[PDB]
């Protein structure tokens, strides 16, 4: 089954369709575009009746060839009625937001977070005790780390997620959401964490208020700076080997280039293309133990994107040891596959 033949590109959510004739992705044209076609495209990506809006935007990508729509066709697929074209009647392409995400109301050495600042933050408990966190990306799905749900914890009935709550003493049974499924990455290597990402599904979909909201996943072609201004949060130990924090802290870290994070005085080429370091080589800010899987978000275009998820580290209050996170950008396709293949 191969059905990831449509995608959104970059911060503007430029809908694209794949053409084997040119073996390239071409943005769709806005002329004669049905909005129900946009709804269908959103469903074909794994969105349970989640559709925000479609609008025409002058192409913000770098494609000279487009995909015009044949309105004389009928009862065919999206790729069947789209034909290659080098221009648009209206100088605008299709922009497709398939969900309302990325809006928020606005850890060692990280100031406490206010309610509504990081609504996607999740605290996952195993035995009424917080093990690690995740990220709300959909009323049902959560993005976390694979090393969190290693055996014996790979069964879905151990876990209960507490989203919308910032206090760990107010996370009582009957406040969280039982997890239906836990879908770790098949290519997760425990010895050397490479594809350390995992999912979680809830029996009861989350209701989104100012306190609870999703975080946009990174579409392809997200031009991020070599040192982009990111944010982290979680209930980790504020002191090396300290106890779990009662309150949800936040910190302002900066992405570190992979070419620099693999030097000899650093993790020494241990970082694979599936991982992204963040933090400071000087130190004083990192995601310590207890906030694994936690969000690493970045703001761009008024949207917070799940850049990565906490994976591992060699120490928190240390220099030349930035936090290492999974590259959610790499895993977005697998995430979409697992979200589509729900039920079958």
């Amino acid at each position, epitope marked *: 089954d191969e059905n990831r033949c449509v995608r959104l590109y970059g911060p503007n959510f430029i809908l694209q369709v794949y053409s084997s004739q040119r073996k390239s992705w071409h943005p769709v044209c806005q002329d004669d575009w049905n909005e129900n076609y946009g709804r269908a495209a959103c469903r074909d990506m794994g969105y349970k009746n989640n559709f925000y809006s479609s609008q025409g935007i002058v192409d913000d990508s770098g494609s000279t060839s487009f995909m015009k729509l044949n309105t004389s066709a009928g009862n065919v697929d999206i790729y069947k009625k789209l034909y290659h074209s080098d221009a648009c009647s209206s100088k605008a392409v299709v922009s497709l937001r398939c969900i309302a995400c990325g809006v928020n109301l606005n850890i060692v050495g990280g100031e406490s977070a206010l309610p509504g600042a990081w609504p996607w933050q999740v605290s996952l408990h195993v035995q009424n005790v917080h093990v690690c966190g995740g990220s709300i990306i959909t009323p049902e799905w959560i993005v976390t780390a694979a090393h969190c749900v290693e055996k014996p914890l790979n069964n879905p009935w151990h876990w209960t997620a507490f989203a919308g709550i910032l206090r760990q*003493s107010f996370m009582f049974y009957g406040a969280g959401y039982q997890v239906e499924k836990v879908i770790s990455h098949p290519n997760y290597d425990s010895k050397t964490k490479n594809n350390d990402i995992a999912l979680m599904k809830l029996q009861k979909p989350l209701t989104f208020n100012d*306190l609870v909201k999703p975080v946009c996943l990174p579409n392809p072609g997200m031009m991020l700076q070599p040192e982009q201004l990111c944010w982290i949060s979680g209930w980790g130990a504020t002191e090396e080997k300290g106890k779990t924090s009662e309150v949800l802290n936040a910190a302002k870290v900066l992405l570190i280039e992979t070419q620099r994070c693999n030097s000899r005085y650093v993790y020494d080429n241990l970082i694979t293309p599936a991982m992204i370091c963040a933090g400071f080589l000087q130190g004083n800010v990192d995601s310590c133990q207890g906030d694994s899987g936690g969000p690493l978000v970045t703001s761009k275009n008024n949207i917070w994107w799940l850049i990565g998820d906490t994976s591992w580290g060699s120490g928190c209050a240390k220099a030349y040891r930035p936090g290492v996170y999974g590259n959610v950008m790499v895993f977005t396709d697998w995430i979409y596959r697992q979200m589509r293949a729900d039920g079958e």
Partner: antibody, heavy 122, light 112 residues
Framework: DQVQLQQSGPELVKPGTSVKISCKASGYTFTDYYINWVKQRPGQGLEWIGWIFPGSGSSYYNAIFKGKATLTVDTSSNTAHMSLSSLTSDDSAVYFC??????????????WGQGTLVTVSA | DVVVTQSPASLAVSLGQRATISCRASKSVSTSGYSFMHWYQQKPGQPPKLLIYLASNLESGVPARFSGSGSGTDFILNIHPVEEEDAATYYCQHSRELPLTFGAGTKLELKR
């Protein structure tokens, strides 16, 4: 738009029955604040019954009132209800509906209701 | 569980003086930099009125005479100068964990 919590009026009810105390919340985004319930027998200090999250509906009942007071919300009309079961003479008191802080972070009640005097006798 | 103990059960003070009400907890209510001890005021026939929250923060609309201090287990509420309108019952409340609980109250009295 000053915030207001408006409770129902006094209730004279027979022992063994139940009474549903309502508290309509206005002047703020309902689902963003927890709504707490507190009891106070005449000249006897305050007593925390429990809270209920309007956004989700999760209710915490103090072990004393678990199995006696059930908390429910009406998100459509922005109203909160408390139902007392098997009312006895002791159940008579003044019940206050209060609204916690923004995220229910501090767990303190900044706005309260006027109180609802409950009399339980035959 | 935590049970707050509030003493004295009643305190009579002349107008213009300082009235100090002390609340103590079974175990520390301070953690992560926040002291979860809040002070209320209830007058005859009125619902309580949050004066101080988090043991040092004055709620908006409250006179600056009311002062909060303390950490861990020991907390104090100060009223100085004491006005005639300050005669009421003052409750200390812990929100460190669940269930939240109140103090037994401290009925204030005015000497005249």
């Amino acid at each position: 738009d000053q915030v207001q919590l408006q409770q129902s009026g006094p209730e004279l009810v027979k022992p063994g029955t139940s009474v549903k105390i309502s508290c309509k919340a206005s002047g703020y985004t309902f689902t963003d604040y927890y709504i707490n319930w507190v009891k106070q027998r005449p000249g006897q200090g305050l007593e925390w019954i429990g809270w209920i999250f309007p956004g989700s509906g999760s209710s915490y009942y103090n072990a004393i009132f678990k199995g006696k007071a059930t908390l429910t919300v009406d998100t459509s009309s922005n109203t909160a209800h408390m139902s007392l079961s098997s009312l006895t003479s002791d159940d008579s008191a003044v019940y206050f509906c209060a609204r916690g802080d923004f995220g229910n972070f501090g767990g303190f009640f900044t706005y309260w209701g006027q109180g609802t005097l409950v009399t339980v006798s035959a | 569980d935590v049970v707050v103990t509030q003493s004295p059960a009643s305190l009579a003070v002349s107008l213009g003086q300082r009235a100090t009400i002390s609340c103590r907890a079974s175990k520390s209510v301070s953690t992560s930099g926040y002291s979860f001890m809040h002070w209320y005021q209830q007058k005859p026939g009125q619902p309580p009125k949050l004066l101080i929250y988090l043991a040092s923060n004055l709620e908006s609309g409250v006179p600056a005479r009311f002062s909060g201090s303390g950490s861990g287990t020991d907390f104090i509420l100060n009223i100085h100068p004491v006005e005639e309108e300050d005669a009421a019952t003052y409750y200390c409340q812990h929100s460190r964990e669940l269930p939240l609980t109140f103090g037994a109250g401290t009925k204030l009295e005015l000497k005249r």
